[PDB]
């Protein structure tokens, strides 16, 4: 068939490189990925160590014409795209097509804030890290190197938690009502014929 769906990845509490390897492999397999919250990823290293690597990175620049030189994107959504692009085929139609199926946003924009989210157990920071190893959020590193919109995302995320918190509470009340209405009609005398089948397989 044709997979027109989008696999939304919530980058919270993950590892930048490990996420990219799993995503960059499945971009080549026809899957469309959207990685929300690419500013909550974690990279091995204290903020002091991460800035040295960035300082080394910023040095690479064409001497005779910096406008042609390597472009160092400070936004975390562009750090992830660069990391993913390094694990994709270079300078061919196959590599470019697979890159078009990837997007980060620092928060959760209008369509992707109500889709089902996924996780990558290989890339989780609780499975691949020593707990005492200091890490660094991409947003925290991005602010250090000149990414100005670290406060807009923190404000937008704050109101997204307040909108979801009340939606979850309202959904919880309806679910409790439906759950307790199912028990009443599971124990009804008329539905014994159907229930007896469910009890046989353990569903009820």
């Amino acid at each position: 068939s044709t997979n027109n769906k989008v696999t939304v990845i919530d980058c919270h509490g993950h590892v930048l490189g490990r996420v990219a390897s799993v995503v960059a492999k499945h971009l080549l397999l026809g899957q469309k990925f959207v990685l929300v919250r690419c500013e909550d990823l974690q990279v091995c290293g204290t903020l002091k160590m991460r800035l040295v690597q960035w300082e080394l990175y910023q040095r690479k620049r064409v001497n005779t014409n910096p406008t042609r030189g390597a472009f160092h994107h400070r936004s975390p959504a562009d750090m992830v795209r660069k990391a993913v692009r390094g694990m994709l085929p270079k300078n061919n139609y196959r590599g470019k097509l697979a890159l078009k199926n990837l997007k980060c946003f620092e928060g959760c924009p209008a369509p992707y804030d109500k889709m089902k989210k996924s996780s990558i157990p290989e890339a989780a920071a609780i499975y691949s890290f020593n707990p005492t190893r200091k890490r660094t959020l991409l947003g925290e590193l991005g602010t250090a190197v000149g990414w100005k919109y670290a406060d807009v995302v923190a404000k937008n995320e704050a109101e997204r938690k307040e909108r979801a918190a009340k939606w979850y509470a309202a959904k919880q009340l309806k679910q409790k009502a439906v759950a307790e209405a199912k028990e009443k009609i599971l124990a009804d005398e008329k539905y014994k014929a159907k229930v007896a089948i469910l009890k046989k397989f353990g569903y009820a």
């Binding site: 946003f105 620092e106 928060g107 919109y149 807009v152 995302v153 937008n156």
Partner: protein, 251 residues
């Protein structure tokens, strides 16, 4: 091999590339940082340079050895006739910088402001803002405007008034006006829009914006010189007289 002697580099790389602008008016790339503990006010204007003269001024600074009878200074005269405010726009802070949300315009728009939306005015139908004006008072349009005002107060952080000049008051031959967005720096966004709405179709003078003995910034486009060599462009040293194929070049 190293250069025998050292000297500062000729020219500044803070302005490379030296690309000439396209529009005569120059837009300020910034505004003074907003303070929310003051009454709303306009933070900009637009004037036409007339010329230069010189004045003798009395020194009021202390502990200075300047003559008591006056110091000669040069002064530029910038004629600034009153501006007409013909609308306002709200901006929102998103993850790609400011994004304008809505632009509410006045009911009556001068022909000076209409000329900005065409290129051959003398052949145009000149129907700019015609539908806007003819349906200004309809309940369908009035309801939409109240939504636009309410949208800004709910989901906007920056307000700027679209003000334009009046070319009839200046000796220039241009008739089309010059449009500038002037930010309102002041209280909450609720009263910024309230202050902005009160200014629709009204005239603003330069005294309402700037005070007395006030330091300001000026943004403009420098005088054009066309193609030029490296001696005038960068101020490099002219080569000795003996040189074959010319003197005024970088060796």
């Amino acid at each position: 091999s190293h250069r025998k002697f050292e000297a500062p580099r000729h020219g500044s790389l803070a302005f490379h590339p030296r690309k000439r602008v396209h529009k005569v008016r120059a837009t300020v790339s910034a505004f003074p940082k907003d303070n929310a503990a003051e009454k709303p006010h306009l933070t900009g204007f637009l004037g036409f340079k007339a010329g230069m003269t010189h004045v003798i001024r009395e020194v009021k600074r202390t502990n200075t050895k300047l003559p008591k009878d006056g110091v000669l200074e040069p002064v530029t005269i910038i004629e600034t006739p009153p501006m007409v405010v013909a609308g306002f726009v709200g901006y929102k802070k998103t993850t790609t910088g400011l994004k304008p949300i809505t632009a509410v315009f006045a009911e009556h728009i001068a022909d000076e402001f209409k000329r900005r939306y065409t290129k051959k005015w003398y052949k145009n139908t000149k129907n700019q803002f015609a539908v806007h004006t003819e349906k200004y008072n309809d309940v369908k349009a009035k309801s939409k405007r109240e939504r636009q005002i309410r949208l800004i107060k709910n989901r906007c952080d920056v307000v700027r008034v679209i003000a334009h000049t009046q070319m009839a008051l200046v000796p220039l031959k241009q008739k089309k006006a010059e449009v500038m967005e002037i930010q309102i720096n002041g209280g909450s966004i609720a009263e910024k829009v309230d202050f902005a709405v009160s200014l629709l179709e009204k005239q603003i003078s330069v005294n309402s914006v700037f005070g007395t003995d006030e330091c300001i910034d000026v943004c403009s486009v420098t005088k054009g010189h066309g193609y030029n060599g490296v001696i005038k462009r960068f101020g490099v040293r002219h080569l000795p007289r003996k040189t074959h194929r010319g003197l005024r070049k970088v060796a």
